[PDB]
Design a protein around this ligand. Structure first.
Ligand SMILES: [K+]
Ligand SMILES: [K+]
Ligand SMILES: [K+]
Ligand SMILES: [K+]
Ligand SMILES: [Mg+2]
Ligand SMILES: [Mg+2]
Ligand SMILES: [Mg+2]
Ligand SMILES: [Mg+2]
Ligand SMILES: [Mg+2]
Ligand SMILES: [Mg+2]
Ligand SMILES: [Mg+2]
Ligand SMILES: [Mg+2]
Ligand SMILES: [Mg+2]
Lengths: 27, 131, 81, 122, 118, 200
RNA sequence: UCCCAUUAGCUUGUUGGUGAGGUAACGGCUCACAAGGCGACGAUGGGUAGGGGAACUGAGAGGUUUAUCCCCCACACUGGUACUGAGACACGGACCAGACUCCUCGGGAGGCAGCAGUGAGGAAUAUUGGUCAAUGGGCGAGAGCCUGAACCAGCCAAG
RNA sequence: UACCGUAAGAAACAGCAUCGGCUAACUCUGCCAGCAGCCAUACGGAGGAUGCGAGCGUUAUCCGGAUUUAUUGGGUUUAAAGGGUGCGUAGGUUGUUCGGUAAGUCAGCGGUGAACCUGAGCGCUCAACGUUCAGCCUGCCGUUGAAACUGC
RNA sequence: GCAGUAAACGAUGAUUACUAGGAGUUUGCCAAGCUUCCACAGCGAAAGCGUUAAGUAAUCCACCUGGGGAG
RNA sequence: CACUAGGGUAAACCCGGUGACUGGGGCUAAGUCGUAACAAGGUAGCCGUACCGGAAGGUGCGGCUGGAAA
């Protein structure tokens, strides 16, 4: 219950989802 | 129920910790032998066997030191559990509390303590440690 | 004054062979590390000249010379059916 | 775990890793200096450390710290590389053995001579 | 063939031999069928320890001893035909009495005087 | 190897004149160096154990590997570890010669043993670390019974008062009765500290 | 008697039988009906490794490695085939096919995992030494001959 | 083994701010460094002192403390760690009592299991070492019994 | 009809037996079967849990072995 | 005439390498743009999912307290 622990995971999820949304529609 | 002997030990331990004077257990032959061994070695004050319509009831009266308000029994430990059975020979019989405790053991000559097991040179299943 | 060939007691597990049967011998012993007593089985291949065994019968087998490729036992007696 | 769980699966042990893997368990190695350069330490330390990029005989690139006061190392110099990492310097986990092959001993040394390859003064 | 021989087992400059029964093709200090004694040639009495019954049994079944092993066996008295006698019995050789022959030969001791009167 | 350095330095560092009697120990009771006799900084218990071990080693002329092996022998042996260690130290041939009084100092006894002026059971033994057993006879070699240094050392040593040593001046020899008790051994070494240092 | 299930099906002489042949010998070992055999108690496949006693280490449980020493196995440039022999992966035997290398114009030789030089590789490891005096081995009726096994000497901060 | 005449032919290496055994002067980024960190009780030299000693330091590798794979001998609310929840196959465990059996278990007897390693000697002037003998065989196999417990 | 995820949480797997007191509360007759808060022993690094245990014990399953890289 | 080492052929598999070009990640400094989180961090925070933005992020829907204030 610090908060930074969840902030790091939130950052990683943001980056991964941005990568996937950029890669969609391109083949 | 998975281990009646461990349950009997747990009932005794919980009664001692709570400070009760009498504890009632469902009866069994091996449990009766263990109660007899405990009375002979002087860990319990008294015992009584009651034969009702069920398997029976063992009623055990515990022993308290009036000088120090301390029970005669300090630790009861189950050794050979159903998930891991333990058998020893007479040469490798355990010694409990450096000989100041007892190890109830079932041998082909009957249920006895590690001292007479070593004397008669018979091994078997280490039921429990008492001290 | 013989040399007492090995003998085993097992349970027939198959008889769908010409004069050959499969005998499964099971036993218990403690684990080398954790000490728990575990079950293991061992299968055999025995010769039955008279084809006098079914399935699940308790049999006694004796060690012989090689009678085939992986067939080294013969059926001595039948203990149960 | 339960005894049955340990019987089914068991325990797993993982072997450690070498602190200086490019030596390949050899105590020392021979190498050739690619670039002999100067570097800056971490935040609480200020200096100009002398490092060399060394190509070992086993075709590995290492950063080796040159110890002592002054050195004669240049490019295409055959040197001996041993283990040992400097704390403030990041990525430098090897040392140059002074007084062996091309690199010479530290001049003017009197104490700790054997650590810098300095002969006993006459 | 089966042989009776010695395996060198001491150290450099001090040889100690183990009298064994071994197949002739075996390595000198390697495999052996049986061990029947030991031999220390460094001591002037030439120390010998031997298992008489086993040595006699191996000679009987036909192990061939080497030269030194045969000499050791003869010294210990294994090489005899007293059992070979088909026309006599209880033929006590008693040659151990003569084989005792205790050689208690010693050396006289002399000393140098210290004339340091100064 | 041997220490073969100055002795008054060690005597002053340890206070006790372990190398006998000297005129330097008076008017100088400080450890050597320019930082001597400047009070006494608090030395740790480990430092005290180390200084006791060094005192024993400099007293008996034994280096560290031999001392460690002697401790291992005492540990293997039956009895008190420290008492056994001191008995083993005193049972060395040079120490036995020194206690018999053939030589003035332990180093003199070691030099005589090395130069082969000492016989054990009638035979020349020249190993200074030789462990003397009770019942053995240690005497001057017959070719060196008229050495001036030996004669001077024995002059005035008519006491020969050590209970565990029987001296015969007619044969110029001596015998060891038994292993003396630690309280009978006249050494100020606290073997307990060495024992805990070597066992911890 | 090691890891991988990010390897789940494998097997057609394969499992059994009848007979014959073959071998020192039993046997699908080979050759001319039935459909069985092995498999989550891990078959099959892939990767890695010679295996033990020692040794080291730890109170023990255990762990690491098999340098020197002993036992068993495998091999002799790479494959194939046998012959001789009581005995053969034939370590100072043969034939054939490969590749490599050497010396010669028709061709012929070698195999350094036996002991010593040397070179290369490497952080790094020695004499092209003496003797069969001892122990062992082969042959010989024995004396004896041979023995880089062995016993010794030389070199090496060297435990 | 013995005789000539000779101290004569034979000491270095690493530490010294705490942990850690050892101290002050002169220099000054150069550096040091296992950690705390230090640009001087820590850098370089000088004087001293402290370890060890024909060695002393550095690197590499392995083991122990390390219980950091925990059978002996660890955990999972919040430190890493309960499957989203059930049903259920294999597997694991099985109330009480009587009688058999003898697979597990217990006991007796027998066989089997160089060198090294453990007490006692003996020989290496001692010691390493070599060797002998007593104490280990505490695994495996065979064969006789016991029946409390588990299994059938 | 797919999809199969959540701070899908009591951040607490399922069974069995045992071991103090108070204060409320739902249901069929003092008493079960529940559902909520203080709190003995005991447990825990502490916050705290405490008969609905995170206490005392037995059986089976799941999972963990420094952080990042990296689900 | 079978048997076979070796040779050629084709495939397909496995193990490796390199390649115009094109993507993340780690580490070091700090140039540039903002201020997302830590206080009710100035719109409570976080989980899942969807869409959208130079970036931290924003918004919708459901959930949680590991949130004040009340
Ligand atoms: K022949
Ligand atoms: K010879
Ligand atoms: K039962
Ligand atoms: K919910
Ligand atoms: Mg985002
Ligand atoms: Mg032939
Ligand atoms: Mg030495
Ligand atoms: Mg967590
Ligand atoms: Mg849940
Ligand atoms: Mg979760
Ligand atoms: Mg903000
Ligand atoms: Mg905000
Ligand atoms: Mg919008």
């Amino acid at each position: 219950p610090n908060g930074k622990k969840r902030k790091r995971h939130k950052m990683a999820t943001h980056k991964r989802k941005k990568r996937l949304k950029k890669n969609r529609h391109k083949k | 129920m998975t281990d009646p002997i461990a349950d009997y030990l747990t009932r005794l331990r919980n009664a001692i910790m709570a400070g009760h004077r009498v504890v009632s257990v469902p009866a069994s032959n091996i449990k009766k032998e263990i109660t007899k061994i405990l009375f002979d070695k002087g860990y319990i004050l008294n015992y009584k066997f009651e034969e009702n319509d069920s398997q029976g009831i063992i009623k055990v009266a515990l022993k308290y030191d009036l000088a120090h308000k301390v029970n005669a029994i300090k630790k009861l430990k189950r050794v050979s559990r159903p998930g891991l059975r333990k058998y020893v020979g007479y040469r490798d019989m355990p010694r409990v509390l450096n000989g100041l405790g007892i190890a109830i053991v079932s041998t082909p000559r009957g249920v006895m303590t590690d001292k007479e097991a070593r004397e008669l040179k018979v091994g078997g299943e280490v039921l429990c440690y008492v001290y | 004054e013989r040399n007492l060939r090995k003998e085993r007691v097992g349970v027939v597990s198959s008889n769908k062979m010409d004069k050959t049967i499969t005998v499964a011998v099971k036993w218990k012993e403690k684990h080398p590390i954790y000490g728990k007593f575990v079950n293991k089985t061992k299968k055999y291949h025995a010769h039955d000249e008279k084809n006098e065994c079914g399935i699940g019968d308790t049999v006694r087998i004796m060690e012989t010379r090689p009678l085939s490729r992986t067939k080294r036992w013969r059926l001595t007696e039948i203990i149960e059916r | 775990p339960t005894i049955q769980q340990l019987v089914r699966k068991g325990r797993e042990s993982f072997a450690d890793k070498s602190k200086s893997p490019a030596l390949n368990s050899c105590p020392q190695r021979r190498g050739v200096c690619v670039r002999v350069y100067t570097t800056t330490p971490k935040k609480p330390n200020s200096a100009m450390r002398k490092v060399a990029r060394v190509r070992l005989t086993n075709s590995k690139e290492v950063n080796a710290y040159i110890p002592g006061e002054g050195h004669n190392l240049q490019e295409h110099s055959i040197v001996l590389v041993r283990g040992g990492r400097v704390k403030d310097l990041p990525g430098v986990r090897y040392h140059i053995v002074r007084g062996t092959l091309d690199t010479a001993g530290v001049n003017g040394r009197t104490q700790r001579r054997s650590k810098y390859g300095a002969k006993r003064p006459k | 063939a089966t042989k009776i021989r010695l395996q060198r087992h001491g150290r450099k400059g001090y040889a100690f031999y183990k009298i064994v029964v071994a197949d002739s093709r075996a390595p000198r200090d390697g495999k052996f069928i049986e061990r029947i004694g030991s031999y220390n040639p460094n001591t002037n009495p030439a120390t010998i320890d031997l298992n008489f019954e086993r040595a006699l049994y191996w000679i009987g079944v036909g192990a061939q001893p080497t030269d030194t092993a045969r000499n050791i066996l003869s010294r210990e008295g294994v090489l005899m035909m007293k059992h070979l006698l088909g026309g006599v019995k209880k033929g006590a050789f008693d040659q151990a009495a003569a084989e005792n022959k205790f050689e208690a030969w010693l050396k006289g001791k002399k000393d140098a005087l210290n004339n340091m009167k100064a | 190897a041997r220490y073969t350095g100055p002795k008054s330095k060690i005597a002053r560092k340890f206070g006790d004149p372990i190398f006998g009697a000297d005129k330097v120990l008076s008017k100088k009771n400080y450890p050597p160096g320019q930082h001597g006799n400047n009070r006494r900084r608090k030395t740790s218990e480990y430092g005290l154990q180390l200084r006791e071990k060094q005192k024993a080693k400099y007293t008996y002329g034994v280096l560290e590997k031999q001392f460690r092996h002697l401790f291992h022998r005492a540990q293997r042996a039956k009895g008190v570890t420290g008492e056994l260690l001191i008995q083993f130290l005193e049972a060395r041939l040079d120490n036995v010669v020194f206690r018999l009084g053939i030589a003035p100092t332990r180093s003199a006894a070691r030099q005589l043993v090395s130069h082969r002026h000492i016989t054990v059971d009638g035979s020349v033994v020249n190993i200074p670390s030789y462990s003397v057993k009770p019942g053995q006879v240690i005497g001057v070699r017959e070719r060196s019974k008229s050495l001036e240094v030996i004669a001077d050392a024995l002059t005035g040593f008519n006491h020969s008062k050590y209970p565990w040593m029987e001296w015969d001046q007619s044969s110029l020899s001596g015998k060891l009765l038994h292993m003396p008790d630690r309280t009978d051994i006249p050494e100020n070494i606290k073997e307990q500290l060495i024992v805990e240092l070597y066992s911890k």
